[PDB]
Write a protein that holds these residues in place. Structure first.
Motif, PDB file in Angstrom:
ATOM      1  N   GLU A  52     -20.987  13.486 -32.672  1.00 10.80           N
ATOM      2  CA  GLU A  52     -20.824  12.744 -31.450  1.00 10.80           C
ATOM      3  C   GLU A  52     -18.844  12.844 -30.628  1.00 10.80           C
ATOM      4  N   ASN A  54     -18.201  12.610 -26.961  1.00  8.39           N
ATOM      5  CA  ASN A  54     -19.108  10.901 -25.887  1.00  8.39           C
ATOM      6  C   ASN A  54     -20.799  10.713 -25.907  1.00  8.39           C
ATOM      7  N   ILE A  55     -20.216   8.977 -26.323  1.00 13.85           N
ATOM      8  CA  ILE A  55     -22.147   9.142 -26.360  1.00 13.85           C
ATOM      9  C   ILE A  55     -22.961   8.679 -25.758  1.00 13.85           C
ATOM     10  N   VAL A  57     -23.230  11.206 -23.847  1.00 16.24           N
ATOM     11  CA  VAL A  57     -23.211  12.450 -22.730  1.00 16.24           C
ATOM     12  C   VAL A  57     -24.092  13.552 -24.170  1.00 16.24           C
ATOM     13  N   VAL A  58     -24.872  14.017 -24.060  1.00 11.85           N
ATOM     14  CA  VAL A  58     -25.082  15.226 -24.863  1.00 11.85           C
ATOM     15  C   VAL A  58     -24.357  16.578 -24.501  1.00 11.85           C
ATOM     16  N   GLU A  59     -23.534  16.683 -25.313  1.00  7.43           N
ATOM     17  CA  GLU A  59     -22.289  17.404 -25.430  1.00  7.43           C
ATOM     18  C   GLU A  59     -22.873  19.146 -26.143  1.00  7.43           C
ATOM     19  N   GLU A  62     -24.096  17.341 -31.495  1.00  2.00           N
ATOM     20  CA  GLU A  62     -24.483  16.048 -32.245  1.00  2.00           C
ATOM     21  C   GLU A  62     -26.093  16.065 -33.569  1.00  2.00           C
TER      22      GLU A  62
HETATM   23 CA   LIG Z   1     -22.914  12.789 -27.193  1.00  6.48          CA
END
Ligand SMILES: [Ca+2]
Length: 223
Positions: A52, A54-55, A57-59, A62
């Motif tokens: 992770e 940004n917790i 947003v799926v970047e 993950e």
């Molecule tokens: Ca994320």
């Protein structure tokens, strides 16, 4: 983290978020199947979130893996926070890469004066509330046992150390609990407690991981 800086995405590859619908605590990945966190972070229904930044947003880096078992230290006392450590086994092994990596356990304890990196998604204000989306970092030294005990009379056990700044302004905080304190590439502490955050003469108090390496290793070997 109060008074820190944006770490940078995936620069702390052993940092995990514990999620129960929402981020509630940090942790540290210590091998492909096990996380160390704080016992006061225990709850059921944990999903471990690795890789992770940004917790919210799926970047793309993950890995989300359910806990299969949680093990609070046998001697954890929730009133004193003595032995504030727990192990979480993942239902499947994480895939380890440059952005998702285990942190070494200490072979020896750390000493006062050593600089360490403390990280997490906890509150960034000391007289306020603001929770970051991206991972925050703080470089801080270990403080002497005597200054730790002087800051918190009657409360510091042999399983606790202080780190941070007596002047105030720079500390871990609510929501960082369970996360890492890494010194010279070794996991020496777990974010545990403190009076408020970043207050003068009230440094952060951390679980002293080096006391627990025997327990960690035997527990992993039999579970
Ligand atoms: Ca994320």
């Amino acid at each position: 983290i109060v008074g820190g800086y944006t770490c940078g995405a995936n620069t702390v590859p052993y940092q995990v978020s514990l999620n129960s619908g929402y981020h509630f605590c940090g942790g540290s990945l210590i091998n492909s199947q096990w996380v160390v966190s704080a016992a006061h972070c225990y709850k059921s229904g944990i999903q471990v979130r690795l890789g992770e930044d940004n917790i919210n947003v799926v970047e793309g880096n993950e890995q989300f893996i359910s806990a299969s078992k949680s093990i609070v230290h046998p001697s954890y006392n929730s009133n004193t926070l003595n032995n504030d450590i727990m192990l979480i086994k993942l239902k499947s092994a994480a895939s380890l890469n440059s952005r998702v990596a285990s942190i070494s356990l200490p072979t020896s304890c750390a000493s006062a004066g050593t600089q360490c990196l403390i990280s997490g998604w906890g509150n960034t204000k000391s007289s306020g509330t603001s929770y970051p989306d991206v991972l925050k970092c703080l470089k801080a030294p270990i403080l002497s046992d005597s200054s730790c005990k002087s800051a918190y009379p009657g409360q510091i056990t042999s399983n606790m150390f202080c780190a941070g700044y007596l002047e105030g302004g720079k500390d871990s905080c609510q929501g960082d609990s369970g996360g890492p304190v890494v010194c010279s590439g070794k996991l020496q502490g777990i974010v545990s407690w403190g009076s408020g955050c970043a207050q003068k003469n009230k440094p952060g108090v951390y679980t002293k991981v080096c006391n627990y390496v025997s327990w960690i290793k035997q527990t992993i070997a039999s579970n």
